Amino acid sequence: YFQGMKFAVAVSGDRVNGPGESEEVQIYETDGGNVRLIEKYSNPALNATAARGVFMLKSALDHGANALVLSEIGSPGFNFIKNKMDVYIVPEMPVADALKLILEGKVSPATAPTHDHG
Secondary structure, three states, X not given: OOOOOEEEEEEEOOEEOOOOOOOEEEEEEEOOOOXXXXXXXXXXXXXXXXXXXXXXXXXXXXXXXXXXXXXOOEHHHHHHHOOOOEEEEOOOOEXXXXXXXXXXXXXOOOOOOOEOOO
């Protein structure tokens, strides 16, 4: 399932955090078991005044990610991304530990946002 996929992770201090507030976007490539960091950059969301989560997600799309790894996602962001790639919501935990759970099938893709004020 996961062979070749690229994951965009929203990260602060090597922990998975939320799309609008994380310090960095980290892009990992996998063969299903081995994982490699192929890119990382300051989260563009931090420069947005509004719709910060959406703008991190747009950045992930720009960067060719196939899936997202986040601690949360709002309604605007989920509606933006939901037909473009999968979102895996995880605890605010170390990146490698989250990716292990995801790759081992222990985190099903989100079908709804985790918060909604629409």
